[PDB]
């Protein structure tokens, strides 16, 4: 009963591969020969945010492009001001190991999660003057890897038990679940219209899930190792994945295959965080060789080098207006490159 | 209008800086440990003598130790074990012994010892079930290892009296099997501390205390470029 199903799955994979080869007209590097290159990108460290003790593991920018959260593994979640370098808030955490954080699009709630398998949602409406644990979401059997807000009521979370979930903040129950992966779902990226979302796992595959329907639409397998990060293009029709084999890959949603492969001979370090710019020309990749690289997304040429950190760069964020780039590494230092 | 908001933000920043200085004085005094092992190792008696993660707060000679025990997780360890990179010690507890457990323990210790980000953290080894080794040697350690018969007893260590020679021979054979892959690519930045424990023993906390003291002393000698 297993041999016939495995051979049918192999025949369907061969049909998908033949369709992807038949739909492959021409590559992007052949048609981007007449494109003017970007050139040297000089980004300097304008601000340096030093208030953490342990390693900064994640961050997220606000909607007003002014405040930003930063979670560390000492038991701190500090809400920084990027303009006047002042600490707006500092939340002490219940569990000291926190692997992800999020900021609301309205600017009211802040979520966090880690090895305690509990998504803690804090409220920034200080009626009493002090922040308190507004909600706790506990329905996963693995570690919480990433979490993002759709609105003030719903939250998409990804866990280490090969499942993603859609939680309602008011009730506290899973609206829908997503079970199609075989490895740890490392990260997710919401669409700008908040209709679909991608999720990359440890089986070198990124799947495109629907929020309203709750089932997978497309699957993308083009890597050789664990996909650590993923990010959408600013229009919402392509995305880029960073993996552990020192290669970045830009996939397309419509063509159902990869468009670009970013690699180099000297780079033998895996990628931790990827993020586009506001327009979509520069692609930021944070490697493990203590510096970040600014690739040209249309010509696959490394334009810039952001080398100011000492330890592994774990989190990288671009604001909505594209004004600055916040990078946080394991030396407890946030840096505002511009 | 902006002056009052700037003064309020400066006062809030001063309060948060005072709170973070106090939290730093609390944080740098406590020493954190990672308890890791297999399923049949016997960590339940270890946590009874001394959710996703399990918290254990204790103190010896007014020195706070916080032990972190991994609970409701999966077998995929290659993503969250990078989170334990600033701990002072990984207490790796295995039992000497169905499938082969010692080879899986050796492969796990080889993967921890040769990790890219775990080159600075020291591993405190614990061999838990010694009474089971004494009971199973009478009527299976020679089947999984063909070099057990062609092995000499080390004379540089003092064994406990009133024991069979085969029991202590298997003890130091397992010890040398861990020290073969331990003393291969260590290069002085991180060390391993093998130990022998039993079920009912309250002398383990002093062993962890002395081993963490040795780790911090070797770290301070490394920072001065003396050792």
């Amino acid at each position, epitope marked *: 009963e297993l041999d016939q199903l495995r051979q049918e799955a192999e025949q369907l994979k061969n049909q998908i591969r033949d369709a992807r080869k038949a739909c492959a007209d021409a590559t992007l590097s052949q048609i981007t020969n007449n494109i003017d290159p970007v050139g040297r990108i000089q980004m300097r460290t304008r601000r340096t945010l030093r208030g953490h003790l342990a390693k900064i593991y994640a961050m997220h920018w606000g909607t007003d492009s002014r405040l930003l959260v930063s979670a560390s593994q000492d038991g701190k979640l500090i809400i920084w001001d990027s303009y006047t370098t002042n600490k707006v808030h500092a939340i002490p955490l219940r569990s000291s190991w926190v692997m992800t954080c999020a900021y609301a699009p309205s600017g009211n709630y802040v979520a966090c999660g880690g090895l305690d398998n509990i998504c803690s949602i804090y409220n920034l409406k200080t009626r009493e003057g002090n922040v308190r644990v507004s909600r706790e979401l506990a329905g996963h059997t693995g570690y919480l890897s990433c979490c993002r807000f759709l609105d003030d009521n719903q939250i998409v979370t990804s866990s280490g038990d090969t499942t993603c979930a859609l939680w309602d903040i008011e009730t506290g129950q899973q609206t829908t679940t997503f079970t199609g992966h075989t*490895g740890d779902v490392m990260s997710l990226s919401l669409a700008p219209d908040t209709r679909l979302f991608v999720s990359g796992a440890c089986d070198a595959s990124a799947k495109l899930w629907d929020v309203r329907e709750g089932m997978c639409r497309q699957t993308f397998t083009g890597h050789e190792s*664990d996909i650590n990060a993923i990010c959408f293009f600013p229009n919402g029709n392509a995305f880029a994945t960073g993996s552990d084999d020192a290669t970045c890959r830009l996939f397309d949603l419509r063509a159902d295959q990869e468009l670009m492969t970013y690699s180099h001979d000297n780079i033998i370090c895996g990628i931790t965080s990827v993020s586009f710019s506001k327009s979509g020309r520069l692609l930021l990749a944070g490697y493990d060789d203590f510096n970040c690289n600014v690739w040209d997304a249309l010509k696959a040429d490394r334009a810039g080098v952001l080398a100011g950190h000492d330890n592994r760069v774990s989190c990288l964020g671009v604001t909505d207006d594209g004004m600055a780039v916040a990078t946080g590494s394991w030396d407890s230092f946030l840096k505002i490159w511009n | 209008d902006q002056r009052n908001e700037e003064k309020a933000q400066r006062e809030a920043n001063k309060k948060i800086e005072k709170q973070l200085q106090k939290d730093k004085q609390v944080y740098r005094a406590t020493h954190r440990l990672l308890l890791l092992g297999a399923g049949e190792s016997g960590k339940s008696t270890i946590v009874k003598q001394m959710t996703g993660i399990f918290e254990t707060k204790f103190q010896v000679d007014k020195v706070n130790f916080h032990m972190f025990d991994v609970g409701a997780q999966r*077998d*995929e360890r*290659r993503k969250w074990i990078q989170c334990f990179n600033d701990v002072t010690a990984i207490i790796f507890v295995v039992a000497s012994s169905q499938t082969n457990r010692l080879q899986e323990a050796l492969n796990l210790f080889k993967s921890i010892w040769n*990790n890219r980000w775990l080159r600075t953290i020291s591993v405190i080894l614990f061999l838990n079930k010694q009474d089971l080794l004494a009971e199973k040697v009478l009527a299976k350690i020679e089947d999984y290892f063909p070099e057990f018969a062609r092995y000499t007893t080390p004379e540089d260590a003092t064994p406990e009296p009133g024991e069979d020679p085969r029991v202590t021979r298997a003890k130091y054979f397992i010890r040398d099997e861990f020290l073969r892959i331990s003393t291969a690519s260590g290069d002085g930045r991180h060390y391993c501390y093998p130990h022998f424990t039993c079920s009912v023993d309250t002398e383990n906390i002093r062993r962890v205390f002395n081993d963490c003291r040795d780790i911090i002393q070797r770290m301070h000698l490394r920072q001065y470029e003396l050792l």
Partner: nanobody
Amino acid sequence: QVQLQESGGGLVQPGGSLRLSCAASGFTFSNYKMNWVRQAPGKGLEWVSDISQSGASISYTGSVKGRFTISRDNAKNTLYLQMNSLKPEDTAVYYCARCPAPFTRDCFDVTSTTYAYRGQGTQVTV
């Protein structure tokens, strides 16, 4: 797409020899240290052997020492395992597995329940 295909097996006589082949496709073969891991019926998975990237560091389990030969061909893009002088205990499902990270020595999740970087395996009954 990462795909690993096993070949060889079948019911043979005890004490004979056999040769397993593992064909890899979808990645660079010369960057990853590879493993052979078996799973007995009614028991869990157990690690058999491994070969490194260049082929210098070759290690075995003690129960299979001196009776197994693991080799690799980077140009031919394949992994061979020669097994002479078998025993009736070796009847298992064998897998050729790939370590998840390149240019490294550590291999964490090779002997696990749900690992995606290994093939469907082959049945060897002695």
